[PDB]
From a paper:
Pore‐forming assemblies were prepared from pre‐pore oligomers pre‐assembled at pH 5.5, in which condition the bulk of the oligomers are complete full rings (Ni et al, 2020), and subsequently by lowering the pH to 3.6–4.0 in the presence of 0.056% Cymal‐6 (Ni et al, 2020). The isolated converted pores exist in two major conformations, a flat ring conformation (68.5%) and a twisted conformation (15.5%; Figs 3 and EV2), both structures comprising 16 mPFN2 subunits. The flat ring pore structure was resolved at an overall resolution ~ 3.0 Å with C2 symmetry, and with local resolutions ranging from 2.7 to 4.7 Å. The ring pore follows C16 symmetry in the top of the MACPF domain, but its symmetry is gradually broken towards the bottom of the β‐barrel. It has an inner diameter of 75 Å at the top of the MACPF domain but a minimum and maximum diameter of 94 Å and 102 Å at the bottom, respectively. 3D variability analysis reveals that the top of the MACPF domain remains largely rigid in organization, presumably due to its large inter‐subunit buried surface area, while the bottom of the β‐barrel varies between circular and elliptical forms. Compared with pre‐pore assemblies, several regions became unresolved, including the epidermal growth factor (EGF)‐like domain bridging the MACPF and P2 domains, and two β‐strands and an α‐helix in the very end of the CTT (residues S600 – I642, yellow in the pre‐pore). A loop between the P2 domain and CTT, which lies along the MACPF domain in pre‐pore oligomers, shifts to interact with its neighboring subunit (residues T581‐L590, red arrow). In addition, the P2 domain rotates ~ 90° around its pseudo‐3‐fold symmetry axis, and its β‐hairpin makes new contacts with the exterior of the β‐barrel now presented by the MACPF domain. The β‐barrel is further stabilized by a molecule of the detergent Cymal‐6, aligned with a strand from the P2 β‐hairpin and whose aliphatic region is packed with a series of hydrophobic residues from the back of the TMH barrel in the MACPF domain.
Perforin‐2 (PFN2, MPEG1) is a key pore‐forming protein in mammalian innate immunity restricting intracellular bacteria proliferation. It forms a membrane‐bound pre‐pore complex that converts to a pore‐forming structure upon acidification; but its mechanism of conformational transition has been debated. PFN2 belongs to the membrane attack complex‐perforin (MACPF) family and shares structural homology with bacterial cholesterol‐dependent cytolysins (CDCs; Gilbert et al, 2013). Distinct from MAC and perforin‐1, PFN2 is a type I transmembrane protein that is expected to be cleaved from its transmembrane anchor during bacterial restriction, releasing from the host membrane an ectodomain consisting of the MACPF and membrane‐binding P2 domain (McCormack & Podack, 2015).
Numbering used by the authors:
A (entry chain C): 217 to 266
B (entry chain D): 67 to 116
The structure:
C-alpha cells in the first residue's frame, strides 16, 4: 500500500485605509466668517484564499 | 463435467478440459483532488464637505 496526501493552503490579505481632513476658517471681527471643512475616508480590504 | 473437476481452493467447479492458475491479485487506486478558491473584496469611500 502507498498513500500520498498533499495539502497546500495560501491566504492573502490587504487592508488600506486613507483619511484626509482639511479645514480652513477666515474669521474677521464680526463682519465676515467663512469656514470650510472637507473630509475623505477610503477604506478597502481584499482577502484571497487558495 | 465427467470428472467433477474442481479448482484446488474448492471454490468453483470446472470442466475436465480446463485448468486454472490461481493468481489472486487486486489493484486499488484512489485519487482525490480538492481545489478551493476564496476571494473577498471590500471597499468603503466616504467624503464629507461642510
Amino acid at each position: 500500500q502507498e498513500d500520498h496526501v498533499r495539502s497546500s493552503f495560501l491566504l492573502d490579505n490587504q487592508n488600506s485605509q486613507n483619511t484626509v481632513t482639511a479645514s480652513a476658517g477666515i474669521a474677521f471681527l464680526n463682519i465676515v466668517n467663512f469656514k470650510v471643512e472637507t473630509d475623505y475616508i477610503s477604506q478597502t480590504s481584499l482577502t484571497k484564499d487558495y | 463435467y465427467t470428472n467433477c473437476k474442481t479448482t484446488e481452493d474448492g471454490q468453483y467447479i470446472i470442466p475436465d478440459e480446463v485448468y486454472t492458475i490461481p493468481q489472486k491479485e487486486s489493484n486499488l487506486e484512489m485519487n482525490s483532488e480538492v481545489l478551493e478558491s476564496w476571494m473577498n473584496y471590500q471597499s468603503t469611500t466616504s467624503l464629507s464637505i461642510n
